Amino acid sequence: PYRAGWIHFTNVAPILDSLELPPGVTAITGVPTQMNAALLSGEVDIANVSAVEFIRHADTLAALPDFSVAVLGPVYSVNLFHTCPLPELRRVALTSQSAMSVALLEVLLRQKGLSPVLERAEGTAESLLAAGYDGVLRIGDDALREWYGVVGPLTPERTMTSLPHTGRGITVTDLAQEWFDLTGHPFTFAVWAYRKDNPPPAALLQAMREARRRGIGHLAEVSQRHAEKLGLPERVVQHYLWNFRYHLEAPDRLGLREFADLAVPGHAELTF
Amino acid sequence: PYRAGWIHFTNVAPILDSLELPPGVTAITGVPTQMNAALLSGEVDIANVSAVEFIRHADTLAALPDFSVAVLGPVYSVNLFHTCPLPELRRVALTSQSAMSVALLEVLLRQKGLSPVLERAEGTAESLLAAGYDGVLRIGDDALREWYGVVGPLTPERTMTSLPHTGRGITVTDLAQEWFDLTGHPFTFAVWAYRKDNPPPAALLQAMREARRRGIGHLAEVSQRHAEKLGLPERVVQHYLWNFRYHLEAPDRLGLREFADLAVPGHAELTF
Amino acid sequence: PYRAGWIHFTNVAPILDSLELPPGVTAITGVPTQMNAALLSGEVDIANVSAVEFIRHADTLAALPDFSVAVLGPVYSVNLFHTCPLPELRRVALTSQSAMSVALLEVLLRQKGLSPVLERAEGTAESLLAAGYDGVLRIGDDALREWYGVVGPLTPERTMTSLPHTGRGITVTDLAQEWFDLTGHPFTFAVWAYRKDNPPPAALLQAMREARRRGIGHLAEVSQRHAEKLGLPERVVQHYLWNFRYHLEAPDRLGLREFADLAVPGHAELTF
Amino acid sequence: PYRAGWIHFTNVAPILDSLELPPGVTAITGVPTQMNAALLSGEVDIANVSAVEFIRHADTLAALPDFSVAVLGPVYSVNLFHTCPLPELRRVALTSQSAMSVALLEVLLRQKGLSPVLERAEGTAESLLAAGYDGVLRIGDDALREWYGVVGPLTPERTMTSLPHTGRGITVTDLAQEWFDLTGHPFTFAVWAYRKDNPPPAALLQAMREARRRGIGHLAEVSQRHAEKLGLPERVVQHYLWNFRYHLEAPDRLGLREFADLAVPGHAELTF
């Protein structure tokens, strides 16, 4: 009697990994593209969609008031791999058809007065960069893995935030970090949205806030599982998760709003 | 050999709790005043001290680059309890000797053009607010308990991020929140400083980093332990700790610098 | 054994020059930061500290009731050298680490609604004034020497209290004089402090009272001795010393408290 | 043939004792009454008269700009001896033909709305207090040793500045101190005056300034001579002299004008 469309990225494991769907709610997973359409149509009633998806449809959609995937500073999962200073960037490859990553990239390039050519294309950052592209935008787990594959290994000495930004000629620019450099504020990448008319049941909300307590309470357990199926050290994933802001607090709402005004001028009002 | 002076505050438990000192280093504790002096005089080589303590001695002291006690938004343990609204404040009680809290309060008041009289008084927020005081400034565990006392109790449906700021006619103004409304940046309350002429052994830094991973990796465990000792629900302490920023990243030193300029004009350069 | 941390500033020569330590009491010296720390730490039991140092620790420290380093009117050693009128000051250099002078300068600036930026710099008043700074703050012997360098020389015909306040387009603003024009009271720069839990031995006090008596009784002598190592006329040094108030009397305590209220709101009560 | 009329009591010893009159000047000593009359009539060209004498004749007289007999707080030689609290006071003996003393006493008594009967009588504070007077006003050297005879003796451990105010049922009220409690400012008891049109020769001013330098530089030596004559401990005369402000600086002129306004409303402009 109530569907939900999750997009199980690593960055959301502290919330979804222990969730217990209450009586009356079902869940199904897939890719951003999938869930988005599902939410708008009705194949699903609630989903974790990108900030851009939510902003573009704020007219008919509402977001939970205390759930988000945000950060202040590096995110490590929204990376632009390039082999030449940004200003010299001429051709960029956009992977996994992400409107979120692109929207944020355009805002950043725009402010810098840049305008390289962007093209849909698939492959690893290293592949595409060896196939004519100056830069390659990547998001999600693959973005995290490839980031690590370039910089690091992360040795017992000196923290993860002590890793270089370049490796084997490739330079990894964190878009969330760029946003901080630009606004000094956090950036919100995703939220939980539902149609203003069809709000979720209380049970689901409590069930979710409880799973989150568990996830945040045992990051070492959450990290290990995923680090293993990601082929990454536990500490990398643990730090990666610790770094996320999940309660859509004022600082997150501020960043979300700053971005919404720059990428979707005249967007309906953002409600929660 | 290398002597460390720790002050086991609740907010640094995730870092010190599982700390195993390397061979050749020992640790003692005491009150801040005593611990800061010891560092400055040479009785101790490294200690966790307040931002203001570090700032005022940035010429003989340096701070570990990846360690801090900061927050973005509310901190919950640096509160100004008051009956009338802020602009009406005429008398403010100062619970204890805390250069850090008053320094931040003064910066906030000065900014708003206000200038209520500040007096050292003895007691709790409730009692002092009933003995002729418009506002009472409290810090630490007492501040956290009294905040939860005025607000809350918390329930399965609610989130701590959703608690009201007033109860029984008592408003609780979070100074860290105020600092965000003002600067939009995070605030750094403490750092790990050492005399420049005596850098810490690499072995100690690695031991500290391993201890922080453990604490961050097991928040539920660090939380239960200190919650009972504080008379607070595990979840209150858990979110409390999750809320802290421990790696002194660019956004944290940005806030630190801003505060520095406002509270200690002409301070020596902050070096890490 | 009772230990003392003396810092032989010129203005204390009348007191410490001929001090004969009682048996069972030793004495060391060093830089202010070092001695203040040692005192609060427990390494030193009594020391001649600045008024700010005392005020900021009035809860743990107490001061001898009849010993001070205060002045009514000019002090000649806490000078703000500037080329443009005070209201036009945009950036002031701080020749050294001195919480005292900075604290006094800030109370005076806030009072006049002025807020120039304060930066730590290195060098003489004239060199720094010829490198972008509108004003330079100097304390101690260098301040005295530079003041004489600017407004001097002095002749048999005229008195020291008659020297102009300008020379070569440089105006020397005496901070103690600014304090008088503002409050009409004396200013207390330093006191003799000890930890409340460890009062000094009567034999030391008596030795001190006796030593001051000798210095005050032979000012020409104390002066002739320091006015040589300082490169100054005996008369400049004699008047400089004669001009100090050493008994921490009612008027001096009045000034001290007025300053403590402004510079250190909420400071602990000053006890003697 | 410039004539001088010195009123030579202990408080001016540091200045006159080693005075060396240049060619063309002579000096005649005597009592206030003689000297004042002598200055006014034309016998003497310059004399160190009381502040009241100067103010009341400010129309025809001018005073030296850097010479004075003033203090901040007690003066120890302008005392009101009494056997009952000031309010219950009802019979005060005026011990001399000094206007300086009664002027100050009356200004003070009126400020407290007190109005005991005042009448001229001759004798020591103790004899007159035993001859039907509950109050006796004394000034000068006798005032100093009768104060000591009451509140003394002085012990090596205790300081003069901490000597009691009462003795054998006799309270000594220091009028300079009363002035401080009333204005927070210094009091000027005397200046060096001369008829406006008959200024003193340069050689005399330089002779005076040099003598002052010598006296202030050797207080112990100056104190002994006078202590013996007065039958007082050397340290008493020494603190007494050390306590005097001799340069007629701004703080002293403020106190002078303050007094002038109260005691001689509408007085002529004081000129130097």
Numbering used by the authors:
A (entry chain A), B (entry chain B), C (entry chain C), D (entry chain D): 16 to 287
How do the authors describe this structure?
The Pfam protein family DUF178 (ID: PF02621) consists of 61 proteins of unknown function, 59 from bacteria and 2 from archaebacteria. Herein, we report the first crystal structures of DUF178 family members, including Q9RXE3 from Deinococcus radiodurans and Q9L0T8 Streptomyces coelicolor and show that they are remarkably similar to Pfam family DUF191. The structure determination of 10093b and 10093f has revealed the unexpected similarity between DUF178 and DUF191 family of proteins suggesting that the information from three-dimensional structures along with the sequence information will predict the family of proteins of similar functions more reliably. We have predicted the protein to be a solute-binding protein based on structure and binding cavity.
The structure of 10093b was determined to 2.5Å resolution using Selenium-SAD. The final refined model of 10093b contains 8 protomers, 18 sulfate ions, and 653 water molecules. Eight monomers A, B, C, D, E, F, G, and H found in the asymmetric unit form four tightly packed dimers (AB, CD, EF, and GH). A dimer interface analysis performed using PDBSUM demonstrated that each pair buries ~3,000Å2 of solvent accessible surface area (12.3% of the total area), a value higher than would be found typically in interacting surfaces for a protein of this size. There are 6 direct hydrogen bonded interactions between the protein atoms across the dimer interface. Such a tight dimer interface suggests that the 10093b dimer is functional, which is supported by the results of analytical gel filtration (data not shown). In the 10093b dimer, Glu172 from the atypical Val166-Ser177 loop makes one of the six hydrogen bonds present in the dimer interface while three other residues in the same loop contribute to van der Waals interactions. We suggest that the atypical loop found in 10093b may help support dimerization. Further analysis of these surface features together with a multiple sequence alignment performed in ClustalW and edited in BioEdit performed for 10093b reveals the presence of most of the conserved residues, including Asn26, Pro47, Ser92, Ser113, Ser116, Ile154, Gly155, and Asp156. The binding pocket of 10093b superposes well with that of nitrate-binding protein. Based on the comparison of structures and binding sites, we predict that this protein could be a solute binding protein, though we cannot at this stage identify the nature of the ion.
